[PDB]
Amino acid sequence: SMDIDPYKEFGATVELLSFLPSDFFPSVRDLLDTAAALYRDALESPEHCSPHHTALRQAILCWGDLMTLATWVGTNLDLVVSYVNTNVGLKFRQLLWFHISCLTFGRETVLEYLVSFGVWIRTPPAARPPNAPILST
Amino acid sequence: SMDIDPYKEFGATVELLSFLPSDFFPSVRDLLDTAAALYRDALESPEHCSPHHTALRQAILCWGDLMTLATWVGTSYVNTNVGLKFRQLLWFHISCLTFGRETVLEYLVSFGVWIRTPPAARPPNAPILST
Numbered sequence: 005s006m007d008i009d010p011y012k013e014f015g016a017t018v019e020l021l022s023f024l025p026s027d028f029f030p031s032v033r034d035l036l037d038t039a040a041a042l043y044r045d046a047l048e049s050p051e052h053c054s055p056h057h058t059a060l061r062q063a064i065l066c067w068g069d070l071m072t073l074a075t076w077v078g079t080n081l082d083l084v085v086s087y088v089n090t091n092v093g094l095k096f097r098q099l100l101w102f103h104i105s106c107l108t109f110g111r112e113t114v115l116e117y118l119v120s121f122g123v124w125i126r127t128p129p130a131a132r133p134p135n136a137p138i139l140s141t
Numbered sequence: 142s143m144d145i146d147p148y149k150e151f152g153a154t155v156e157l158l159s160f161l162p163s164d165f166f167p168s169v170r171d172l173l174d175t176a177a178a179l180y181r182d183a184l185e186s187p188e189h190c191s192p193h194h195t196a197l198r199q200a201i202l203c204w205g206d207l208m209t210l211a212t213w214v215g216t217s218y219v220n221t222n223v224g225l226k227f228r229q230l231l232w233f234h235i236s237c238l239t240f241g242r243e244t245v246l247e248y249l250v251s252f253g254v255w256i257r258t259p260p261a262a263r264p265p266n267a268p269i270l271s272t
């Protein structure tokens with residue numbers, strides 16, 4: 005193998021993304037819907053636009069395929085569909101979110117937030133402010 | 142439901158890739174070993190390098206993850222339908238990086254025409270990829 009890190013070029017890492025808990029991210033369903041609402045046009049465009057765009061186009065598509073395979077598994081063949089939406093799902097949720105968020109609010113920001121929440125959420129309930137960190141520009 | 146074309150930002154289409162036959166493409170096996178032997182460093186690197194680099198990184202991992210699914214299922218379709226889609230994209234990109242984008246598209250059409258000429262008429266020499 006190689007050791008290719010998607011995020012590395014963008015200035016994150018696969019670990020750092022695993023710093024936010026699995027339940028921090030939207031659904032895939034909702035991630036797709038947003039990109040569409042905000043960036044469908046840039047995304048379908050034949051213009052590079054940004055490295056976020058390239059990557060997101062490819063992810064959106066890869067997920068399409070992945071789903072066809074789980075559907076086709078339903079048609080033709082509990083087990084797998086519990087696994088896809090679980091492990092693979094998280095991995096897409098992460099990448100989708102990183103990149104939509106990077107574009108919506110700014111990348112530098114999305115990283116400042118990435119740590120802030122990781123730390124905050126981990127402060128146990130007793131001591132930690134009820135006020136969570138906030139994402140904006 | 143969006144209609145996104147991966148190749149479109151690079152000035153091709155899914156259509157055009159389907160122009161070359163299913164067995165024009167290397168193996169997935171050989172495609173990964175080639176990217177490695179030529180661009181392990183460029184790809185693992187944290188520099189964008191080019192939009193090609195970006196897409197390949199993603200393509201590879203997507204394949205990686207997909208295969209990890211088969212390392213769990215075993216407990217025939219994949220390589221059939223999906224395999225082609227990877228082959229087309231991987232080949233496209235490596236082949237752009239190696240020889241040139243415009244140079245690969247010229248070949249894409251040169252070959253598609255050539256292969257489709259019937260045996261009796263068609264010159265014995267398939268066209269050539271290089272710079």
Ligand SMILES: Cc1c(C(=O)Nc2cccc(C(F)F)c2)c(C)n(C)c1C(=O)C(=O)N[C@H]1CC[C@@H](O)CC1
Pocket residue numbers: 030034035038100101102104105108137138139140141
């Ligand atoms: C919005 C948001 C998100 C978030 O990630 N939302 C989100 C949901 C689905 C998909 C995606 C996609 F980008 F990946 C993002 C997170 C984690 N926080 C802490 C926030 C907010 O700070 C917040 O509620 N801000 C308001 C409202 C918005 C206003 O523009 C600024 C003020």
Ligand SMILES: Cc1c(C(=O)Nc2cccc(C(F)F)c2)c(C)n(C)c1C(=O)C(=O)N[C@H]1CC[C@@H](O)CC1
Pocket residue numbers: 167171172175231232233235236237239268269270271272
């Ligand atoms: C190389 C090649 C390929 C091809 O696609 N090769 C290939 C195989 C596995 C992986 C990849 C990768 F880019 F994804 C590419 C095709 C279709 N043709 C017609 C050729 C050649 O023109 C050829 O053999 N040229 C020689 C040797 C090379 C010299 O630089 C010029 C002269």
